[PDB]
């Protein structure tokens, strides 16, 4: 009669990160934007589609940059979240009870 | 033949019948530099 169950309750801090990127716009793009936002008989369709295509290209590049950098940040934090083998394995083997 | 030959996998053969009259020709590429998303705002 000496045995008894034991429980362990670990609680974690959640930490905090963020994201940010640069994305510039020219005034001519905004001007052609203004007519396309009210797309009607006027406003050259070819130029409007050219401008929107170019802007969408740049926007999707800078957007996919986020997913590109997520892997960078995660690999960095795991690299900062590891001890060396030559310092962990000897204790991992040479400690039967403590 | 050329295409069935294994070396042809290093070339992109395309027909250009109107070529003898070329004075001149240029082609353009628009490669851009990908950016890593540094998280903090600078």
């Amino acid at each position: 009669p000496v045995d008894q169950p034991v429980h362990n309750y670990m609680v974690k801090r959640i930490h905090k990160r963020s994201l940010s990127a640069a994305f510039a716009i020219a005034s001519e793009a905004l001007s052609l934007l203004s007519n396309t936002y009210v797309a009607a008989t006027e406003i050259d369709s070819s130029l409007r589609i050219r401008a929107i295509q170019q802007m969408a290209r740049n926007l999707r590049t800078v957007s996919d940059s986020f997913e590109r950098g997520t892997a960078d940040q995660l690999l960095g934090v795991l690299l900062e979240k590891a001890p060396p083998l030559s310092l962990l394995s000897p204790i991992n083997k040479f400690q039967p009870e403590g | 033949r050329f295409l069935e030959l294994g070396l042809s996998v290093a070339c992109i053969c395309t027909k250009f019948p109107e070529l003898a009259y070329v004075r001149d020709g240029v082609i353009q590429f628009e490669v851009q530099q990908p950016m890593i998303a540094r998280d903090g705002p600078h």
């Binding site: 396309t36 936002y37 929107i52 999707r60 | 020709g25 240029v26 082609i27 353009q28 590429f29 628009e30």
Partner: peptide, 21 residues
């Protein structure tokens, strides 16, 4: 901008060959 287009998705840009005459 009213987009109304597919969100790019690996844009296949076009090679343009220019002829001088």
């Amino acid at each position: 901008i009213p987009a109304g287009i597919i969100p790019t998705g690996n844009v296949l840009s076009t090679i343009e060959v220019c002829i001088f005459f």
